[PDB]
Amino acid sequence: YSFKCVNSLKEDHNQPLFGVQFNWHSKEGDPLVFATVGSNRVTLYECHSQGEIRLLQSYVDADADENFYTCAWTYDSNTSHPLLAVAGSRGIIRIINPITMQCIKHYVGHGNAINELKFHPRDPNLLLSVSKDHALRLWNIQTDTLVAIFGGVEGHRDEVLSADYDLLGEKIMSCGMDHSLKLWRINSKRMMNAIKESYDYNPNKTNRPFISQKIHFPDFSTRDIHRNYVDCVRWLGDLILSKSCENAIVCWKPGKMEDDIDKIKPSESNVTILGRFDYSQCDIWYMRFSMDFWQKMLALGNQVGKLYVWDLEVEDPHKAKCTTLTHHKCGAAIRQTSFSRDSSILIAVCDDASIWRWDR
Template sequence: MKHRRFTGEGAFELPESAVTWSLQDDWTLLDNGDTVSGNTRSCVSHRKRHRAKGRKPIIEFFAVKFCPYQPLNADPVFAAVSKKHVVVCKLSSASQRGDIFKTIRLIRDDDVGLTSLSRPMKGLSISHLFTHQPNATNCCCTWTRASETGVPYLCVGGVDGIVKIYDLVNGTLAGGINDLTTCPSDPSIIASSSDDTTVRIWSLDPAHEEQPCLCILAGEGHIAEILSASFHDNGRYVVSGGHDHRINLTDLNQWTLPDFPKGHIDSPFQVHYPHFSTSAVHGGIVDCVAFYGDQILSKANRDNVIILWQILGFSSDDPPPPHDIAPLPHIPQPNDYGASQFTRSAFVPTVSPQCPLQYDRRLQFHTPKCDEYFFLRFELHFQPNQHPILTFCNRTGEILFWDLERVKAYDDLMGTLRDPDRDRSKPVRLPNWLGRLRPGVNGKSRVTSVSRGSQGSRTPEVEDRRDVYDIADLNPKDVAEWDSKYKARDRDHALEPHHKIEVRSKGRIPFLGRQVAWSPGGEWCAVAGSGNVVHMLRRWGEA
């Protein structure tokens, strides 16, 4: 099957629903004071989702991540995290529809006899030993890997402010943890974003056992809880976003990967000022950020869009700017509503008529029905030899997909059709991912109109409707629909989803998707959310 996965039409395939899996209620393990689903500190803003007195708390998975440290031909393993459970499952491509999931381990906070680890222990796998935290209320996770053995570990965090590493070390924070991410260039390094307005860089290397926190991004970066952080592929830069509507880009400064100290350190290095900071991209709470090369993907509640944008003047190939030129916060001036009030950058320190902006929007992606809900996180599947695919699930259970390669392919296709110098005796093939075609001009199919000698088209008679000689033969409704999905026409146009799947809920309350994850090989896509449900999608196989 591999030949059709990454070449030709197979490379453009998007997944279909495969199976839905759910976990038992969390409510039996939660006390009356639990509000992880009921206030702005802990992820949900809409009052309709507040837990009414005397009712069960909202049950839901907040995070799902595939283990990235497996061979592409291995059965993928993923972890899903709810408030009181962590479940680790394996997917089997060869299994029948109802037997896709195999649970490797279920971690519950009412388990007894669990051991809390404070140092690496050789010979133990994730299914053998776990950390017990009776007051844990989890909401995020990431996979990492031991530097000495290469064994994968699962890191889990939540509102108790503890990074739990099954089976490695614990580190405490002053506030709850809202996101965890692993450094692409060094899997033993992770970053946590927290309610205490910091991003902290942690090492799982045994050499840093006594002081695992290497670096703290704090100071004048964020002024409210941070909900999301992501490493650049080179490990040098971190982008973060949160409740203050800000998005910050920070250079990790004197200790940058792979140059983090290899031995013990007495105290973490602190970075006080980001090299770029803006509150102008979004008008709401920024709950998800990610790098796409040197560009940034981000979303916020109330905007109903994911935005792809770039910091002008920034290139990861250039030497990083010196620490001492990181811009200081602006002092607000009365009646000053200029761009400098909302954005500061070390890459374009001052605006001018020649360079009036410090960042540039590239694309927008329409994510309807999000409204004021936040902590709904997208995922960019971006692997070598595979198309970059952006995926998101909204509050009504609609899973939305955008294949970024289709945007480029569509631009090339329409450019070819509109080329006045093109040899019009040779057909242009329309790809299958454009979908079914309406009848051509004048309400007739192209074949019929041509065979009857229509004067409205110069297209020779063809047998296949996907072979097009002239753009005039296309139905204008088709072109308008394609443009809405694939044409990067202007900065204000948000691309409609290329593919949409609706998760049907058994009850009256629709499925709310919290996080999306892709398997490394690109075959499986998991969406975790309300009801402790994981909805699994699959491509290149039986759905």
């Protein structure tokens, strides 16, 4: 996997762009579109030939003091139209119609900053938010219900910075400033039932409020992978990729080498390290890697505008093949990357509000 830099631009606000996401629910034949979030806005662009990045429209929050950190795409499960969720310092999740940029509805709960949003891989209505208040929450955006809060003293003890669902959306791994990675299974009887009841809730037809699950005990926890804030995590099948601000993505799994992930118990005290991908100059926290749709590759930018891309299409994780992408004018910290669904474009976004387009 090789790329060349075809364009770049800078947004007018000059504040960090903390998040970038292509819409992988784009319709066939339509051009590729991505969203950026930073300052108090989200902006959409369309990718065209000759490197063109065509500016469409933004949503700008009414509060000049909001600062959006994260966004995620889904679609309306009745109409198929794409939807974009965004959130950040105010702790309010907004669901935006990306065509008109109207905010269709919003959700409050965390009241406290939201550091990441992820939609479930099989159900477009299930949205996970992770917060500076130390909890994760799972919302159903079809019935507008809070399904569950994942927290308690056995939960995270400091800001949660990232989380990821596994392939089938059976379990979440979360991580944050307490240096720990925690697993929360959502295919328990209690959680599958809470999900089904969330779909059954319509406040116009009943008197009761919808009761959320309080999940106070993760199904596995470790602090033995990193020694500082853990700011991005992703499943790779039954293994985990996670990073801190220590210039390494560690590939690891709960338990011993031969332990099946669905047999791990909450008291498991071991982990197995399958590999580690080192890189340079990424000492600051809130720096996220992304993978392509197929999980064949992983990209991470660092604090001086260098991109690293690992090819994971190899027999074992430690055999990953790295290439790097540099441009003499890109020298600000890269906060997040995103691949188009077809893998032909990689976009990096930066602390000086610039956006960089690399074409395969």
